[PDB]
């Protein structure tokens, strides 16, 4: 099967910027009949994909002029000349020269730039309600940060705990263009009660040092 | 303008099968092939197969090993995808795609052994510039979805409700709310959670 490799995986832009996304195929997509079946789709958040460009450079019905496709053989590029908000989403290339199977790249996420921002970190002990039940989840929120790359570790009495951790990340915020993350560490009540110091520890571009929030049981 | 309407969310057990429909209208058709493509949690896209509405011929992705069966009901402008011997791997959003141009709205398929399960709802109390952060933990439910609000929508600014994640084999969700620090605990904050599948409706006030 033809492997489609898109780069970069994420591309922050400001509105009005030019943006450029690449797609490389593992084989020539030039068909015997002389055509090249390389296509580009955009998937906006919460929606299904929509066709933008077919056969390398042809804009699909309704697609504006600021989108332009080019390339040949195994090297292709989608350019947006002046980015608009309606353009933000995930771009996928696909090929239908060599089939079956039709194949797709993994997608490039076009996102909005903003100034870097450190997360606001809050930590929460288990509620009484949960401890009654025999469980103990400790929760950490790391909120409204930028850029989106972030790491969290849980450290209890001076040792990291990686078992029982559940993470979730939001998509870029519509108003302020930030990201947020939630990390929950689930332990038994007996385990929770065997230790005193709980810390959520993050690394982010905005500090050279780890960012910590802690409580003592 | 091909409009493609897909059938609703499916939940199946491992080993079972699923059939999804796609109703074509417009617009309208040039009788192009109907393709089926799925998209997994990671947003990657995988082509399953295509059927020609006219003569009924098909082309399948070999990797499905004939677990997939595409049909058309010409008399009703309806295409179908049937997938058997389901495993958790097959959990995805499934799309029909007419001539690879127009995409349906997608059908969620969840493959799981889990039974319907009410969540436990826990308040998350603190201990901050001008502000304080509170939260709500909705743990161990099945199936999706749940809805969650704070002081019945009163607070919506500075709320973050995180995507559910499936810490095998139940869902857990959380939500934080950020308000002016002088206003809590002096004013009541409450998490409102509903999980219709289990007839769950709860309100949890967050206490100091």
């Amino acid at each position: 099967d033809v492997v489609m490799t898109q780069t970069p995986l994420s591309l922050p832009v400001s509105l009005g910027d030019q943006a450029s996304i690449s797609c490389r195929s593992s084989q020539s997509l030039v068909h015997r009949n002389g055509n090249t079946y390389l296509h580009w789709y955009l998937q906006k958040p919460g929606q299904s994909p929509k066709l933008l460009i077919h056969k390398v450079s042809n804009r699909f019905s309704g697609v504006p002029d600021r989108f332009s496709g080019s390339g040949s053989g195994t090297d292709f590029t989608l350019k947006i000349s002046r980015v608009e908000a309606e353009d933000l989403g995930v771009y996928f290339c696909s090929q239908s020269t060599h089939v079956p199977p039709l194949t797709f790249g993994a997608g490039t996420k076009l996102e909005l730039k903003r100034a870097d921002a450190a997360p606001t970190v809050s930590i929460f002990p288990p509620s009484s309600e949960q401890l009654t039940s025999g469980g103990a989840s400790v929760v950490c929120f790391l909120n409204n940060f930028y850029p989106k790359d972030i790491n969290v570790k849980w450290k209890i009495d001076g040792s990291e705990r990686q078992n029982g951790v559940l993470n979730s990340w939001t998509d870029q915020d519509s108003k302020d263009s930030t990201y947020s993350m939630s990390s929950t560490l689930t332990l038994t009540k007996d385990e929770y009660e065997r230790h005193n110091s709980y810390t959520c520890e993050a690394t982010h571009k905005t500090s050279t040092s780890p960012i910590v929030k802690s409580f003592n049981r | 303008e091909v409009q493609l309407l897909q059938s609703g969310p499916e939940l199946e057990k491992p080993g079972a099968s699923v059939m999804i429909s796609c109703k074509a209208s417009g617009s309208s058709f040039t009788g192009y092939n109907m393709n089926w493509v799925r998209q997994n949690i990671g947003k990657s896209l995988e082509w399953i197969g295509a059927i020609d509405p006219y003569y009924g011929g098909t082309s399948y992705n070999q990797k499905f090993k004939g677990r997939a069966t595409l049909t058309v009901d010409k008399s009703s402008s309806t295409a179908y995808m049937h997938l058997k011997s389901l495993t958790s791997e097959d959990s995805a959003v499934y799309y029909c795609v007419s001539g690879m141009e127009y995409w349906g709205q997608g059908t969620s398929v969840t493959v799981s052994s889990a039974k319907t399960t009410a969540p436990s709802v826990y308040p998350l109390a603190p201990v901050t510039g001008s502000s304080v952060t509170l939260g709500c933990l909705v743990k161990g439910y099945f199936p999706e979805p749940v809805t969650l609000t704070w002081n019945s929508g009163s607070l919506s600014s500075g709320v973050h409700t995180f995507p559910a994640v499936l810490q095998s084999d139940l869902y857990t969700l959380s939500s934080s709310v950020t308000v002016t620090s002088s206003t809590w605990p002096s004013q009541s904050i409450t998490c409102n959670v509903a999980h219709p599948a289990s007839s769950t409706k709860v309100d949890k006030k967050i206490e100091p």
Partner: peptide, 14 residues
């Protein structure tokens, strides 16, 4: 049928 705008006119469905 084959969609010549997206695939070869002599595609598998021809």
């Amino acid at each position: 049928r084959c969609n010549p705008n997206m695939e070869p006119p002599r595609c598998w469905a021809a």
